[PDB]
Symmetry: D2
Amino acid sequence: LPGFATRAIHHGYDPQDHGGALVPPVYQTATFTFPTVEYGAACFAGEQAGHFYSRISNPTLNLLEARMASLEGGEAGLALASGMGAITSTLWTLLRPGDEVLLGNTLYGCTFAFLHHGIGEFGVKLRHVDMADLQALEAAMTPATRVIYFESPANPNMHMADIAGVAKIARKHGATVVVDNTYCTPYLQRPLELGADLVVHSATKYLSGHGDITAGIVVGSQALVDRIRLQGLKDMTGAVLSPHDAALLMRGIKTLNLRMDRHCANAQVLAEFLARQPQVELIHYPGLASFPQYTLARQQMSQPGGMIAFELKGGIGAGRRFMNALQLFSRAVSLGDAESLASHPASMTHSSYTPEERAHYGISEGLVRLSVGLEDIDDLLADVQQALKASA
Amino acid sequence: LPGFATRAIHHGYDPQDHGGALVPPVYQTATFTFPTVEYGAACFAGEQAGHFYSRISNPTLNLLEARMASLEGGEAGLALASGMGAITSTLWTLLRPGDEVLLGNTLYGCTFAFLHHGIGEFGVKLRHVDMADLQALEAAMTPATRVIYFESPANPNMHMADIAGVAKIARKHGATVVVDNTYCTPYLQRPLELGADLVVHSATKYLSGHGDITAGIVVGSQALVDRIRLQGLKDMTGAVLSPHDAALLMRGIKTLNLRMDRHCANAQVLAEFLARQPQVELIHYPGLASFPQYTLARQQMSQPGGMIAFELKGGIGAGRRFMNALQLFSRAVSLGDAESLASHPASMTHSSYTPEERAHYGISEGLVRLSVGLEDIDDLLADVQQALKASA
Amino acid sequence: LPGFATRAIHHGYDPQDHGGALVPPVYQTATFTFPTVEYGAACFAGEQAGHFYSRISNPTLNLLEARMASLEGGEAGLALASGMGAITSTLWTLLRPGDEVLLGNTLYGCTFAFLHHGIGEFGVKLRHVDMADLQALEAAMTPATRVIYFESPANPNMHMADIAGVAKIARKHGATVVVDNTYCTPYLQRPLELGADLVVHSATKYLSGHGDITAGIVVGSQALVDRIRLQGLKDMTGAVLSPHDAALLMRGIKTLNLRMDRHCANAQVLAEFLARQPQVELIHYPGLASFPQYTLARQQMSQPGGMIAFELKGGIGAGRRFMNALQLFSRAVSLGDAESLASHPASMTHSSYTPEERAHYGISEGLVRLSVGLEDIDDLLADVQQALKASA
Amino acid sequence: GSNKLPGFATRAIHHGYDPQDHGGALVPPVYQTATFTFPTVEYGAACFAGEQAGHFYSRISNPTLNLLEARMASLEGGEAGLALASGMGAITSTLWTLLRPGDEVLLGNTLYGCTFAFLHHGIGEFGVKLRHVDMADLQALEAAMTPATRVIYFESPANPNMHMADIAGVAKIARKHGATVVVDNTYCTPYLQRPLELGADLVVHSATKYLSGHGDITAGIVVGSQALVDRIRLQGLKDMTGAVLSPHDAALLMRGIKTLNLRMDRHCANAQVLAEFLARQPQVELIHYPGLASFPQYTLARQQMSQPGGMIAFELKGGIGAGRRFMNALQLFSRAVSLGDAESLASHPASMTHSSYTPEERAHYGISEGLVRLSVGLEDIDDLLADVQQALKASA
Ligand SMILES: CSC/C=C(/NCc1c(COP(=O)(O)O)cnc(C)c1O)C(=O)O
Ligand SMILES: CSC/C=C(/NCc1c(COP(=O)(O)O)cnc(C)c1O)C(=O)O
Ligand SMILES: CSC/C=C(\NCc1c(COP(=O)(O)O)cnc(C)c1O)C(=O)O
Ligand code: MET
């Protein structure tokens, strides 16, 4: 097996099948023609290998899918119009009324809304559990539990789950484990190699790396991915990725290892800085020895990532003023871009929650989240220092 | 009030607001920054204009949306990753368990599959009514009836619905009427002006015109579109259109009127030709007097369209020989491209129906569907001529 | 031999050669690899047929080139980064110091600048001559004359050249005739079929049709085009066209016929309107019976085009008022877009600053030129009408 | 305080763009438009003159291209930038504006093939005189200067043999005599070498190579003084080449420049390990890599380039015959021209990038027949070593 960087650049592509083109040509085409109608009819049956319509399958997208599967260590992949496209296409195809889903305690806002105000209003039972407390997860398992879905680390407090420990319990009771691996990427964490069945990404984030597309990835077994493609995507969401955006995603993926290395090194220095500052009340960063689940972090992630969450002593007022004072960091949702970003999740990413749900599921009101970018670390520190003075 | 072609080129855009740029700049960006966090909070709350995240809203998508709303005569538009994106996003937000939806007799494969094997399996009631028969429709209206959905003309037999007749009934019972206007386009038929509440398009087809993007549009009232954007798209499908694809779609729309004229002219000559041939049992083209619903087609559609359906005497076997001998037409699914396409809906586009579930909903044995393109008519006649000779 | 529109959609491409893709895939790639190095050495020698570097040759560019060659009735085509790309690459290849180039009396501004302040200052002789007047052209020929270069119609006064008469005179001295066919496009005029050796285009204009790319085309004999590719383009200009832009150009070419029909019908109407107005001293439009070269225009052009130039009685000040009053027409240089455009070169384009510094070649004082777009003619008429009233 | 210059990486991501000026878009929107319009026709008069700041036509200037231009200027440490359709578009647009019949250009001993061909068979045939000089030999350069000498033009390291020039030294001689110094900086990028900071007047790039980094576009850049870059914009590009960069391709180039520092770091680290491995090998006659002490101009490399780069040049014992068999055995490296891509490439200049040269012009101007050039990519170094190791086995 070649190394991660070699596969992120080369896997699934030989230039000699495409006129020698070093870069794969872009199949910006909705439909594909047939030499005979029996050949075309065989394609629709699955009996012959080929393409007919890009919503179902497209060669540019397939190469992206194969490459991402290789990177996650899984069998098959599916590319979609957004991260929400990944999650919704996936869960619509795996759940039906009366099924129960076990959720991580804290979730990305639109995932939470999808579950509670979307598929949960169509007869699917939901129950939130602390996926780091394996006793409690075991106790919450019923025979109607079909899916355990969580993020590790969680957006946005960085709460972790023991993935292999959860997978053990799901094997024991017969549930499908679905992990949102957006924050880490396959470069830092591979939930399929720890017993998960499916992983989902917002490829909008680190995998793209440059903030210029919206996209989603699903990786897992050929059996599960084929059902998500032919039902979730085809019929229930229609979240088709543009070949153009798929080509850019592949372009971004070729520097993933180099980007994550720099994201992680910048974030480590910044986290250590913030931990020594008088205005900071507390800080969640997996790379800090004070991180509650530091041991599990080093067990599961090869590096501590580029995301930091912290609270300021002065509460929401100080957080507002910290944020307005930033000149190099931009005030924006999203993450995993070259540009450093900051946000207040209660008023933004986690707006979809009520005040009561945020307090119950762990989204504080004075919390700020930083996506640490690829800028020079001295420039980012100088920006942060002066914003802390301004926060008071 | 400027004419249709004028609005298809200019509506919603003044070059003076974007540094004089004649063509609108492409906002290929996932996220948008805020000058203060208060500004950002306000964007999420809805109480101020601007942008935050392209899955919810993007200025390039907004121009397309506003422009499509003008063409259709609606208050608001929404752009999505595909036709199925538009349909599913619309229906996932309007319906809940115990609601009923009355459908047209014939539907596009994946719409049918979505309805019966997707949302239908989540506690929603389906019932199929002839939407030309107002007596039957009235007798199907239960107080659970929340939505009325149909194509007119229908894919692929060309069945018309009485849009003003249906809307009359729906206004009395408080039902929302949704019309898939893909085949006609706003240039030929505007269902909102005949009383529909929402129109959906596969913009993949005539609106793009060139077969290079997959895309969907929803147009209707502000209040319905706002709900479909903020629930269906945001939370339940994530069917986000690429700004790149939206700029290609806007580019296509700029020649819609000229393209539709030529599609219609070419298809008229070809339909009239196919009527006169001995190998043809029947034919469904709205611009022949022979067409069963000719009078209703003239009241809704300003021209008869680019699509022909027909049967050969010889049946399924003669279909194969005809299709396989076409040398200018291509054997492929889809429609509304510059290139002329030929399709066998049983094995291809309507494969999602079981054998003789096709026959319950009017999908014949030896039905060949043509999407007539923009090529020189004499070349299209010659090609069809020699193909009929080879089907003997 | 298939019709013009059929060739503009299909020529040189079969979907069976590229996985069935209806639309050709875009080779957005700088380099191409070789299976062995003997294969690679052959490619640079010209022995083996393949690809090595997009600046020299790219499959996406080749398809565009073959298609543009088919439309103009030429052996071969070359795609370049702009119309000036095409013109400069052509002339740098064909001329050396001491060679003379014979020039149409009026020329596009940058072509004039290139000839006079560029290649003319490297020892190449220039002479301007009326290319309608065969007596003076024959008298102007010298042994040094190697190239005869002109536009017909000539920007911006619509003056015409006798292409077949010029070619006949060129054949007697072995000189190469190069026609800028930008205004007409191959749909309206085909200078190669009237005896010219090479045609050049700003494909930026009508061929694109939508104002979103800059591109040049050269079409002519294989031997000439090979040399412009391997000398002009490769070494002397580096005016490489992006494959992405070449894909868009081909997308524009698919509606060239329909767009040109509409451009011309709109311009005929606006010309007939302006010819009768009291504010209008003089008008140049090939379709008007009063047009000085009406008979010659109709020998060479199948339709009279989308461009109009006219003179207002009030001179420079009236020109400004008219231009400033247009609400629908945009004040811009360029032509051939869906959007209607107006320029008033006496508010300074064609590079010159006073009366008498003007009018060596026919650029005047109250001359405004219109690129008549694809909008509804009643809207265009209304806009021109109110602008005429404001000009008084 | 605030008068400190931001770091290279910060400027490669941010310089010249505030999201506030474009509806908050984090990524600049792409101006894929040929033409721009005016609010009045007097405002239009001033934009072809140059009293008013603004836009009219993309072949002259465009907001997406201006951002790219200003950003590359910042990185090179020059006043202004220009974006063109290719490396050759940058070179030709520059030389067509600076030279006229009677002028002499002093040229580095070895040049990229199409640059050589442009000079000898192109602009040379239009009355411009040419002289080659070893630009590492400052005494020879001084001796070669004449009062008709107008431009000094060279690459450093040169394509394909890695020969170098003392840029600071050439600039000093040029200051004294009055010539304009133009350096093709393709190989190093502004991350490794900044010829304007050493005294050059203009730098040109094939941005097709490391700046893009991903092999999907063709593109050129010129950076220099405002006066010289304006002249090149309005004469070379506008009238003499028309080598206009697509705004789409300029957006991709900017996307690539955001990872230039990281990619270059990894190119150099990979090539260094690979060069040391090739130095130890029995099949290898010689090897030119600037990071080995055996490199003829080792101290000059160290003095001008902050890292040794991604390009290796070597020769096998067995000559051209052994080249053939080695290159045909590679399975991770690709056989192709170009360089500075994520994918590792191997080529053979005499039949490839330098085919424009005649056989005696290759022996003269330092281009051997058995020379094999490597552009070391971003793959895992153990995968690359293994591929080169098994390829040397089959070349025996
Ligand atoms: C409320 S707007 C902020 C969007 C952000 N996140 C998105 C996201 C998605 C969904 O992915 P798209 O569908 O690609 O966004 C899925 N999974 C995770 C862990 C995510 O963080 C944000 O973090 O700020
Ligand atoms: C025979 S095709 C090989 C392409 C290679 N070279 C490119 C190049 C250019 C020209 O730049 P575009 O015009 O952008 O290619 C200019 N200047 C330098 C120092 C270059 O290396 C090659 O080395 O293999
Ligand atoms: C399985 S092959 C599909 C190609 C065909 N139709 C699609 C279609 C859609 C769906 O739209 P996307 O989601 O944009 O394809 C919606 N509405 C209508 C009337 C449609 O015809 C076809 O061959 O008729
Ligand atoms: C730099 S002058 C540009 C003029 C414009 N391209 C025209 O067609 O007239």
